[PDB]
């Protein structure tokens, strides 16, 4: 198989909206949230049973007026490999999730 | 062999490059981030080993907002290998990681 | 010649409070200019943001950061000085 | 009978600060208690962190955030009130 970019971003979305959909920021909880978000996709794109290796990251940053900055290049084979990023605000925190799809 | 202790230094050398000894401000920031990722990449593809490489680098004004990350990955648990390092000044928390994988 | 009335902070920082106060006292004649002197001097050294009030009969209710507040007499001039924001 | 010397903020807020202070200035007789009453009341309404001075002789160098500063007299009694941090 290969790496459908939609069949990850639709799969990420659910994750995000599951874990942190319907609650604001709170320290005693955040890290267990990110913990889930990621260990949630993984549980989904491995059920998927593709000949792929994966990497999956989550940011969550409080909205307080700090200035965040993303940067991410890689070194794969552009034809076999691909990656999906996804961005998700509420009122009290932004959030960024990025899964990568390297082949064996 | 994914020499993690050695590729440790490689990342800490992505501060002896760009303004990894100045201070932070908005209009000039996205010059650094991208470049930190770039230079750390060349010095393992120059080595042309049988690895692929993903590499991310993140920057957040030291304002007093909370910051949290997640590192779930799925690979050959003997040849494939990760390295993440942290560096901050008085302006900014900075945080970088890189992933090598097989074949 | 100082009389400390109420102190939170710093000994060493306590000093630069009195020390540079004593200076404004002799450099400037008007309460407002004294204030401005001590404020800026402290914004510079100890990082924003500070607030100075100088007078003879005033009253005050303020919120400061732990270990960044002082209110003291120089001669018979009230000097209040604290960080908040 | 209240003169506004300098204001940043805000009709309603302004006139609310004014009409408050007057209450303050008839319940309480001690200058430091007048400040107390106003500072407290504002944290309640308009959110921390406010600061108040109430005096006949004083000057001030202060730093506030936008549309949250006021400085007026009630007869002779001057009120400084601003938000910061």
């Amino acid at each position: 198989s290969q790496f459908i970019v939609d069949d990850v971003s639709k799969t990420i979305k659910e994750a995000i909206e599951t874990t942190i959909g319907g609650n604001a920021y709170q320290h005693d909880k955040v890290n267990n949230w990110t913990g889930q978000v990621v260990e949630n996709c993984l549980t989904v794109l491995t059920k998927e049973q593709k000949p792929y290796k994966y990497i999956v990251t989550a940011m969550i940053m409080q909205k307080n007026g700090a200035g965040l900055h993303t940067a991410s290049s890689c070194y794969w084979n552009n034809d076999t490999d691909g990656s999906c990023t996804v961005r998700w605000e509420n009122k009290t925190m932004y959030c960024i999730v990025s899964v990568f799809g390297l082949a064996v | 062999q994914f020499i993690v202790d050695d590729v440790s230094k490689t990342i800490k050398e992505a501060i002896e490059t760009t303004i990894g000894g100045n201070a932070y401000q908005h209009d000039k920031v996205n010059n650094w981030t991208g470049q930190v990722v770039e230079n750390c990449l060349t010095v393992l593809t120059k080595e042309q080993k049988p690895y692929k490489y993903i590499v991310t680098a993140m920057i957040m004004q030291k304002n007093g907002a909370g910051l949290h990350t997640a590192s779930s990955c799925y690979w050959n648990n003997d040849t494939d290998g990760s390295c993440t390092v942290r560096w901050e000044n008085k302006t900014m928390y900075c945080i970088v990681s890189v992933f090598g994988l097989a074949v | 010649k100082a009389v400390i009335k109420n102190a939170d902070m710093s000994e060493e920082m306590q000093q630069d409070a009195v020390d540079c106060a004593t200076q404004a006292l002799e450099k400037y004649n008007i309460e407002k200019d004294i204030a401005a002197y001590i404020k800026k001097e402290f914004d510079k050294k100890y990082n924003p943001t500070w607030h100075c009030i100088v007078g003879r009969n005033f009253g005050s209710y303020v919120t400061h950061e732990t270990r960044h507040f002082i209110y003291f007499y120089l001669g018979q001039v009230a000097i209040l000085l604290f960080k908040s924001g | 009978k209240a003169v506004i010397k300098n204001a940043d903020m805000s009709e309603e807020m302004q006139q609310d600060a004014v009409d408050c202070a007057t209450q303050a200035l008839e319940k309480y007789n001690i200058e430091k208690d007048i400040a107390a009453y106003i500072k407290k009341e504002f944290d309640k309404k308009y959110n921390p962190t406010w600061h108040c001075i109430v005096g006949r002789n004083f000057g001030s160098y202060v730093t506030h955030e936008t549309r949250h500063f006021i400085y007026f007299y009630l007869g002779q009694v001057a009120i400084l009130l601003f938000k910061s941090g």
Binding site: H27, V30, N31, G35, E39, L42, K53, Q62, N64 | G64, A65, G66, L67, H68, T69, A70, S71, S72, C73, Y74, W75, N76, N77, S82, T84, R86, Y93, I95 | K5, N6, D8, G55, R56, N57, F58, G59, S60, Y61, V62, T63, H64, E65, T66, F69, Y71, A78, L80, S84 | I30, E31, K32, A35, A36, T49, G55
Partner: peptide, 27 residues
């Protein structure tokens, strides 16, 4: 073969420097 991994990690919450509330008057 292919497996899952950690989870390092990073977590840095806020701090909001403390603050006290003191009142003063003059003699």
């Amino acid at each position: 073969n292919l497996s899952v991994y950690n989870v390092q990690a990073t977590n840095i919450p806020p701090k909001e420097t403390l603050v006290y509330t003191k009142q003063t008057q003059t003699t």
